[PDB]
């Protein structure tokens, strides 16, 4: 997260950190039930040198605040039993960039570990709405990740504006969120983490960090997978 601030302990208890064997934190995720996380499909694509698609090579840290303190009170470490990438995920365009991660054993909810509510398929996050992004990603493009979880408030961008700022790169599964003046944005290492819409005292997951053109640049807001459209797919594949 560029242009954010340190989160409070326990403030985003649905935020999860996914570490790949021998590499540390790679992507975020969100807790949606005791057994399931939402993340981004593109985090689980192989390269030469590492099979990011292999569920056995990932460790999820729930209840984490500081990457240098992974054995702190309240952290729950879990292996993954499987990764369900969306059937229509396209790794050349990032359309349908969403995956469901099954924990090997359930999380226990606590003051530091709690699920985020899913939006139903009719839920709308209208252009202009202020929502939050969180993660341990880089705090500048080309920089290094944050040890302490970062948060930043950003605004939903109109879909036609989004399409035009990033021409031939935006599909209906995507949403731009940020500021047209840049400054606050997600960045590398925030991928797969949640947008949190705080809106009464209810909080809904709005989307999933996916990609962007650099980070925090003007007229280049971050791009996120929309979540309401996937409610039934989540239900069918996880029961959640």
């Amino acid at each position: 997260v560029v242009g954010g601030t340190d989160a409070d302990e326990g403030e985003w208890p649905w935020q999860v950190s996914l570490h790949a064997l021998g590499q540390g934190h790679i992507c975020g995720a969100s807790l949606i039930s005791p057994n399931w996380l939402v993340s981004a499909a593109h985090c689980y694509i192989d390269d030469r040198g590492f099979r990011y698609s292999d569920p056995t090579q990932w460790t999820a840290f729930l209840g984490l605040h500081d990457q240098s303190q992974r054995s702190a009170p309240g952290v729950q470490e879990r292996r993954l039993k499987r990764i369900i990438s969306h059937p229509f995920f396209n790794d050349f365009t990032f359309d349908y960039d969403i995956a469901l991660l099954e924990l090997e054993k359930p999380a226990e909810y606590s003051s530091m570990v709690r699920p985020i509510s899913l939006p139903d398929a009719s839920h709308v996050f209208p252009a202009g709405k202020a929502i939050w992004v969180t993660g341990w990603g880089h705090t500048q493009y080309g920089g290094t990740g944050a040890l302490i979880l970062q948060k930043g408030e950003i605004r939903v961008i109109n879909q036609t504006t989004c399409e035009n700022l990033l021409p031939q790169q935006i599909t209906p599964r995507m949403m731009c969120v940020g500021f047209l003046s840049g400054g606050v944005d997600s960045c590398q290492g925030d991928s797969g983490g949640p947008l949190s819409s705080v809106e009464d005292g209810r909080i809904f997951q709005a989307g999933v960090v996916s990609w962007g053109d650099g980070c925090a640049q003007r007229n280049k807001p971050g791009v996120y997978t929309r979540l309401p459209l996937f409610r039934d797919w989540i239900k069918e594949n996880t029961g959640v």
Partner: peptide
């Protein structure tokens, strides 16, 4: 187009 080349997102990978």
């Amino acid at each position: 187009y080349x997102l990978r």
